[PDB]
Design a protein around this ligand. Structure first.
Ligand SMILES: Cc1ncc(COP(=O)(O)O)c(CNCC(=O)O)c1O
Ligand SMILES: Cc1ncc(COP(=O)(O)O)c(CNCC(=O)O)c1O
Lengths: 405, 405
């Protein structure tokens, strides 16, 4: 940086701490990642500077000839990546992407069927303190109490009983592959649309390591920032038939001027995902998650669903008599960042929980491999099995520091 | 830039064209501006990298110690700038700032009273193709047919008749000072909340050149990117009493994770606005707008309301027998960027219009003064009065190029 340090020492000092923190810690929050310098450079550009309500070639302001190229690069790279008939790269976030789809297909009060929020469903999938749950009537399907795998008979019984106008599939904390074909078969049975929110697994879908929802769903939403490793923002993919309605849901519907600088960063991240080394990266993410899962079970931990098929894992801490809140706090003391997270059928509230959610996308981006996963799991075992020992905590700290340099 | 040019030549070529375009044209769109390099550097930072749902010291993820400092710098600088009891710097845009206030105070179907959309009201103030107009029952107040000044007797009669739960004041195309004291007096008469959307005039308010709505309104919303000259995004200001409800409206209400890099750029722009040279800049904006207005009337143009009290002006092109659409197209041919815009009581539709909206915030940022305003007005007179002359158009092009270098 050149002008920030001189103009605003306070903000520059805080940003520099954040940068150093990102390097010094072991980032295991399942939704995080580190973007490339090219992505950052696109979002730190003068494209911030342009008003561009509307779409490429159909704007409400003049002078959009060059931002139109950037937006079209994003939309066409997206379509090449996911094979969708249409993309909308304007959503300001994963939440706005979902909000726009809901605004397109639902009337206030309509019934929506989504994944139980304490079994893996996201906040934007029906939480009563979220617009989704306030504006519409959400009903949920759950996972089997023993396998922790989505119970497709339960999805079907709930659909047939509640007759939702829309079915939402996908999650923020589900460690197994989702069967989009079964979701579409149920939606068709009851005449409902199907929306797949692939925010956590988009990068895996792009690399062919997770079945692609595009051929089965009427709408696919996502964050551009988690496994896809793009800038923070959203995207909607959909069939050509809903293209105009989705575009209008975004603008003049729920947003105003798009963030063109961020849309340029989206295109840059989409370009990176189209390359072969991103496919090799994604494979390492999934390979790393399996390794980590296996290594954690070697330490004595129980994992929700018994392991993982993607980038994430959920540790059921009941066997160690720990709440997710306690485990997150003590891991934070040694430099390991995780989230507390409810487990299916959790006896504890969402603010306490009986589990921790972990993912490997961030550490894989920094170069960690199978040997690092073995060490991280050994570190977590030492800490969580010896919570009252300051000597264990200090050793863990030194082992974390050896990993991060 | 260093990594973008090598990683993505396509996106870098388009961004570089956009940068050159920004320098070569005369930017008169009233909502645009150019941010500083320090603001851009903050948004091109690694803060993109952090999940930070929740608020400073009350986050749903660990490791937010340093982004909490950045967010608090933004909120405290905002409060120093505007004198508000609370600020929320998370809105992803002006639209989300308004959406969150509406989510806080209104139930679906509630009545809202806002400025007539063809008299200066914004799209997010009741358009029937916008969420505001789809979710709530908007009714409008207008400007006097001759002075084009808000008719406060009409605001009051509409309030008393329709009994709105909320009254919205402010606009996207109103060239005169708004009397927030009268709006608050009417809201109190009918027991309605008062929301002021100051997006276009925030920078003028900050510099003391426009009366501050903060002391009169329950809620104040704004874009951080127009006269305030910050990154693209929104902000809500409000009394302490609604603080918790507004925070919850934003998260877990209508958004998810905030853009922390953008919040850092907000703080940087707020720091710049707190300095004396920003006050001198704002004064030049208003001085420039008056000069430009006077110079355009010297050319024979009629201006809506007869001039301007802020950064913007509206030309009624009826006397020249031109639609805003035609004038915008021919100004675009010579390098001058404006927007077509309906005028109060316009006989033409919103897609054609009888006017052009112009503002001076962008050209003032690049250093233009009173002499430049005189030349721009002489250029617009030459073009709009000689629309079929290619010689006039070519001369205009050479005069624009002499201004932009
Ligand atoms: C499945 C899923 N969908 C939407 C969001 C919201 O995205 P945002 O950009 O934050 O508005 C998320 C968020 N996930 C964050 C996390 O799991 O840590 C999501 O997972
Ligand atoms: C008064 C007013 N309020 C909200 C917006 C929406 O902001 P955004 O960041 O685009 O969602 C605007 C937009 N103005 C743009 C223009 O007038 O050119 C506004 O004016």
């Amino acid at each position: 940086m050149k002008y920030l340090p001189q103009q605003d020492p306070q903000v520059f000092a805080a940003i520099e701490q954040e940068r150093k923190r990102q390097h010094a810690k072991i980032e295991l929050i399942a939704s995080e990642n580190f973007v490339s310098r090219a992505v950052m450079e696109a979002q730190g550009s003068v494209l911030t500077n342009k008003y561009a309500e509307g779409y490429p070639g159909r704007r409400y302001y003049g002078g959009c000839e060059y931002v139109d190229i950037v937006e079209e690069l994003a939309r066409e790279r997206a379509k090449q990546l996911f094979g969708a008939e249409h993309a909308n790269v304007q959503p300001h976030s994963g939440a706005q992407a979902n909000m726009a789809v809901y605004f397109t297909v639902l009337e206030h009060g309509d019934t929506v069927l989504g994944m139980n929020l304490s079994h893996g469903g996201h906040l934007t999938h029906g939480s009563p303190v979220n617009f989704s749950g306030v504006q519409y009537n959400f009903v949920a399907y759950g996972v089997d109490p023993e396998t922790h795998v989505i119970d497709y008979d339960d999805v079907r019984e709930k659909a047939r009983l509640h007759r939702p106008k829309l079915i939402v599939a996908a999650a923020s904390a589900y460690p197994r592959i989702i069967d989009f074909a079964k979701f579409r078969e149920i939606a068709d049975e009851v005449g409902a649309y199907l929306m797949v929110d692939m925010a956590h697994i988009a990068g895996l879908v792009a690399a062919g390591l997770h079945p692609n929802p595009v051929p089965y769903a009427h709408f696919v939403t996502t964050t551009t920032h988690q496994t896809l490793r793009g800038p923070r923002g959203g995207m909607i993919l959909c069939q050509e038939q809903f293209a105009k309605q989705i575009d209008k849901a975004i603008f003049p519907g729920i947003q105003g001027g798009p963030l063109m600088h961020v849309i340029a960063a989206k295109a840059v991240a989409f370009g990176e995902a189209l390359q072969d080394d991103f496919k090799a990266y994604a494979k390492r993410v999934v390979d790393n998650a399996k390794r980590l899962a296996s290594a954690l079970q070697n330490e004595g931990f129980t994992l929700v669903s018994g392991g993982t098929d993607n980038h994430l894992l959920l540790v059921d801490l009941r066997p160690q008599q720990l709440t997710g809140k306690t485990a997150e706090k003590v891991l934070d003391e040694v430099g390991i960042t995780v989230n507390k997270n409810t487990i299916p059928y959790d006896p504890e509230s969402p603010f306490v929980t009986s589990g921790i959610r972990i993912g490997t996308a961030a550490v894989t981006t920094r170069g960690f491999g199978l040997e690092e996963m073995d060490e991280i799991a050994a570190i977590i075992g030492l800490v969580l099995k010896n919570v009252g020992s300051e000597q264990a905590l200090e050793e863990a700290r030194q082992r974390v520091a050896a990993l991060t340099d």
